Design a protein around this ligand. Structure first.
Ligand code: HEM
Ligand code: HEM
Ligand SMILES: [Co+2]
Ligand SMILES: [Co+2]
Ligand SMILES: [O]
Ligand SMILES: [O]
Lengths: 153, 153
């Protein structure tokens, strides 16, 4: 896992990328295609390109390089924002509060019941099943952080 | 994982909680402590409450109810926002493009290389280490989806 300052280092350098995404995208695919030419074979519109000069001249490769870094940028920013909220929760529940995963199952059961009983119109079998799965994802994320810190519970 | 409609149910359902989070929180915690009393003994500020009467009467149990459901709401929203960008990318690259994990390593190395080259000033040893881990987490997320869909990456 990444520390708070590491995630901030990644967002910090990604700001520099987004400021000239067209050029960065170009260089990254040329770096890919020259270093590992088997990768060029997946791209119908590019596999004809033989040299760095032809690849730099390809408007298609330029535009796809931007499509790739735009998508990556968005996914890393989303990953970082999930971690900024998950990490301190996991940290405190592990080391200070000392809450076994089982107890998080208990509170998950409670959340489902209170929701069924207070908002049954908005909480059918399908929503109840959706909310059940979402709370399992939340506990598995805490659980994957508990193993990292070596918290036994 | 969950379908777009499932997440939308969870998010709809969450809306009805945010209308009265104080009350919802209070009942979840009271339902938790009555059902499983060992959970009350992790709260050094609530373990003096013996009855449901004392518990409904606690200003701070109620305020802690709001803290729990707020944080849980926040984290599930960020979880869903990450998935919504991971899923389509994993889908297309597994089923249509058929891109093995190995190739995602190559493009990861290329991004790191071009950032070392073009932006040393925002990309020293620590920042490079940070990005290396961040792209590892990205590949793992993709690899986890590859398993679900049956694609051998
Ligand atoms: C960080 C890594 C990557 C990102 C963020 C990324 C992102 C994308 C995006 C957004 C698309 C267009 C929408 C889509 O089809 O899903 C795309 C298309 C594609 N990607 Fe990737 N990709 C990555 C790595 C790779 C690698 C390593 C390869 C091949 C070696 C690859 C091959 C392709 C191909 C063939 C297409 C279709 C191109 C076309 O039809 O014009 N991707 N990629
Ligand atoms: C959905 C599940 C849970 C969420 C979202 C959650 C969230 C939080 C938050 C945001 C805090 C305050 C910040 C912090 O210290 O980390 C907190 C504190 C705490 N949580 Fe949790 N929690 C959950 C489940 C549990 C369970 C099951 C227990 C115990 C059985 C527990 C015990 C505590 C304790 C003891 C504190 C310290 C309270 C104090 O001294 O004032 N949590 N929780
Ligand atoms: Co999560
Ligand atoms: Co991710
Ligand atoms: O790509
Ligand atoms: O909590």
């Amino acid at each position: 896992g990444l520390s708070d300052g590491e995630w901030q280092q990644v967002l910090n350098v990604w700001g520099k990328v987004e400021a000239d995404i067209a050029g960065h995208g170009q260089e990254v695919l040329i770096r890919l295609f020259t270093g590992h030419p088997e990768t060029l074979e997946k791209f119908d519109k590019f596999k004809h390109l033989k040299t760095e000069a032809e690849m730099k001249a390809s408007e298609d490769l330029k535009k796809h390089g931007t499509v790739v870094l735009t998508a990556l940028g968005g996914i890393l920013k989303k990953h970082a924002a999930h971690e900024a909220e998950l990490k301190p929760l996991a940290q405190s529940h592990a080391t200070k509060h000392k809450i076994p995963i089982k107890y998080l199952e208990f509170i998950s059961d409670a959340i489902i019941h209170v929701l069924h009983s207070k908002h049954p119109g908005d909480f059918g079998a399908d929503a109840q099943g959706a909310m059940t799965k979402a709370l399992e994802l939340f506990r598995n994320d805490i659980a994957a952080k508990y193993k990292e810190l070596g918290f036994q519970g």
